[model samples]
Target: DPNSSSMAERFDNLVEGLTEERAMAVILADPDSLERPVDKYMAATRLGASNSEESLDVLIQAAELDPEHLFNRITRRKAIDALGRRKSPKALPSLFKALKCSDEAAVINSVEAITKIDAPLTEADHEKLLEALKGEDIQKRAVIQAFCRLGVPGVINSISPLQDDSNPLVAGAARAYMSKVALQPDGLEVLIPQLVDPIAGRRRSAVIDLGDAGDVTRLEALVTAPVSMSLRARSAFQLVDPDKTCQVPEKYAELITQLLQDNPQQLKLRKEWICDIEPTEIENNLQHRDEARQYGGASSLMAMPKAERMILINEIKEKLWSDYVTHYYLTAVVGLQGLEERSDLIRLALAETIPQYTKSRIAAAWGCLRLGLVDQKPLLEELSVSAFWLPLKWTCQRVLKQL
Candidate 1:
């Protein structure tokens, strides 16, 4: 009786000496097997690991459990999956029914089983998948995955809109699925337009997939666009040198990394990519999408013969000092980056602007102190206390330390 309280013991006795044939019998014949989920797990796992037709029959029968007595959603999911794995037509209806009841796990496992069978999409099943896609996140994610597995024609219709979904799981799934489907004639034509679709979900899978095209134009646009960051930590301030996806790993690297900590490889890759691109192109781009582009005039800056970095540096300074006080729009703030060795020049330029009320003053306030002006240490210390933004206070304190 004491050992009965232990599920592992109960399991060992049930299968301790059992053959596959006998184990199959014990599981199906047990009256209380489905009452406890863990016991149900033992039976269902063996039935699933089972290769016998009779085992398949038991798996199917359980998969069709009464939805009304949904006192248990676990056993049916278990059976449906094992049935699914066995690969035959007899259990398809029960697999379909198994989908109708259960929590996210049960429903998701049903989706997984149906995938194993490579079940053709019934119009009704397609409708169910799309419906589930709009609900619980976990369920929606699995359903999106099922959509991928099944190759639902016009999968774009189902998943493209999900790109903008919060977890972004569906977006990634759809992107890969679209690639698989694009090999068919007329596939790219249907897919390419989804990028411009009105709904975020409608464009979701499309945009992510577009990243790998390597031309990366629209993908770059998506990466350059802003996203909300989590408020959890000073992870809040990524303090990195650089920043992903039109939908490619590169695109996410380009987009997401732009906001976080410095990644030299990413910054280098983009610089390499951008260098090959026309300077006018960077000008037209929110090339500021790049942290490397933070200073502006990056095209000429990168192109400079490595012989004289200071001219561009001086050029950026002239504009900063000439305009900051009068609200003059200049090249530096237009967004530029990859200044290379000209960082010292920027401090020299900003030091001159230190006493003025250029509108960019507040924006460049931190840089002004990096000039290491002994007089500016007090300025940084003062702002360390009074700065309104915690990020800025942290900034001021950092500068004070470095000073």
Candidate 2:
């Protein structure tokens, strides 16, 4: 029949008969019982969301019981969630412990708890995260991200300046969070209105902040063009963030009108700040490369894929042949990495007369050659044995050693 109407009242009625003491015992009291974990999780979740602050300790103990096993991830998550409801500083220790555990499911809940907790992300929390930051890049970004989302003002300052940090993504995370805190607050609520703050300082904050995220658009402009500075540089007049990326000067921006959105996956910084990373590497030096670039589209060379990978490979090589504007123009050939013959394109850039700076261009070309099985050993041997440039020669040699 048609139900769910009185489900709330029925749920309350059923819950009314349950006691907090018994509820805490349900999740783990008698491990041999049929309903322990299920009952315990149900009750723990209710209590956490309810006003049973007294049950916090029991829930903390229950949470640790959730090892890196299977379904109990729910039980552990419920227990962790319950502890957060009380919003006490006392919960920080247990929460911090859970945050470091190998249990993946519970980690997000623990992080979510820490981010929105009723208390300030205290020194204790920050201390733990600072310790984590020292461990590796994964924990480094993971820990900082949790704290920054907590939005404790001083913490933002700790990470805000990290956009300039030289993390190997440690800084990427900082860029993400600072962008979240500084440029794009109100969650996509029209950046146009807030640039002036509608109510703040002299508001003459031009060139206020400079960030470089994925697929950045051109940031061209005049001091008083109608749409002088926009986040999306859809056209020439607007100053859409910056396409200069890797080495864009951290300046500019005093125009308006065009407009564009932004991203913030974040530094992935500061002191044990509770975090963690990997064994050596997951993929090249790409652990922190932003997957979500702003202006990434069909025209973006690196963003292209599969069949297009081969089809576009030729044009890319042609473009590289004449492209004086791109810094690593030689590396442009590496985009064909997915093709049956990626090195075919890269080899063209190696032809005798196509020379640029023998040192730098060869260094970049070394990177493209490394991407294929097309065997650049002849060239690599040639360069490694005889290139006269100081660093580029050593760099090409190191590429061989990397094998």
Candidate 3:
């Protein structure tokens, strides 16, 4: 159990182990059958990863599933993502139709799918995306990024109108496109300043745009820029090696080496990094400055003998409710204790909608599932769609499938 993976990892591993036929059966199974919505979601994801021609057909049909329908929308999102992964031109029309979906993820997935297909767009496809630019700022940002990647004709002119859009992110996205496609120095000039912007969202967006500009020299500013370690690490990961291949090019070697102690490999190799922690050290471990130690602290709490954990139940409850960062691991410890008496507290945690609390919310949902608190299903369903974080939403969806 000490070597167990996170909930998201375990879910993905389950899907990874499923055979194509089995996954397809889940998808084609009776709608009125005992299968849950999450079953179809996983099946759609499995087929998306499949290379068979039939998978494409099923995914294309799956892509068109009622995006407005409750619970089924997540399956549609996954199917759209699978089509993007397949990168088949034949899936283009379905993807384009997805542009009009009420679901933002579907539209975003459609844009990515079209870009991945890497096929020439018809005039209508161009027009459809151009219209999509007028949609939500998130959708606009995605469409603009796609325009840059696809080398869509007149992209500068297409995006220029948004340069002054009221929304800063939408404007920033326009400038990002301008910098990457038009080779406009001012575009980056505008972006680099936003790196130091007080707004966290602006800083993160700047990092993404700068990376898209594809100039390692420009990203050197990140070495001293005040930002989250994760964001800083993410920006470095993008330039040195965005594909997670773990390869650091000679051109980026010096910049990357200076920004990080380890090689420009990954933002977090958390699973590969673990250490021993004595039960006596639990509180101190949790309070340690180092993240790994904090993780160790949480792990120890989960792995300790029940009698030992019982002695620390009050402290565990305090940390579980008060601390945001360790809740993911701590919630698991709560479940491991079979703390059915804490079901009300777990329900409160599940009710929270904050993005920062996503990991904890996911763990809480799993706790509910593990504890047979089926009444929490409605909360999980709401989280599945309303979660600010996509993975959290997916996690809720995955949990719903099993619940």
Q: What's the TM-score of each model vs. the native?
A: 0.40, 0.37, 0.59
What tens digits encode model 3's per-residue C-alpha lDDT throughout 1-403?
1112122111124343356887776664445573464577678878877999987898888888775556567777888888888989999888888888888888898898888899988877799888777788888888988887776656567798787887777877777677667776475677677775656578678767776655566767765443433455566656666565545666765565444321112222244223344555777666665544455566556566666666575555554444555454455556545577566556766765545555566567667767878898888888777766543454566568777
Among all windows of 10 consecutive residues in model 1, the one with the lowest summed lDDT is: 239-248
Report how far residue 292 has shifted in candidate 2, in Å: 14
> What lDDT does each candidate get?
0.46, 0.43, 0.66
Model 1: CA > 4 A from native? 1-18, 26-39, 67-72, 182-403
List residue ranges in candidate 2 displaced over 4 A: 1-22, 35-37, 66-74, 132-142, 152-173, 179-403
Listed per model in order, the count of residue pairs whose N, CA or C atoms clash below 3 Å is 30, 23, 0
How would you order the candidates by lDDT, starting with the best? Answer: 3, 1, 2
Winning candidate number (lDDT)? 3
Once model 1 is optimally superposed onto the true structure by TM-score, how far is the C-alpha of residue 145 displaced, in angstroms?
1.5
lDDT of 1 by residue, 227-335 (tens): 1111111222221110210121332443433322122122222333333333344343223432234322343444445445445344444433333321111222221
TM-score of 2: 0.37
Candidate order by TM-score, decreasing, is 3, 1, 2
Candidate achieving higher TM-score, 2 or 3: 3
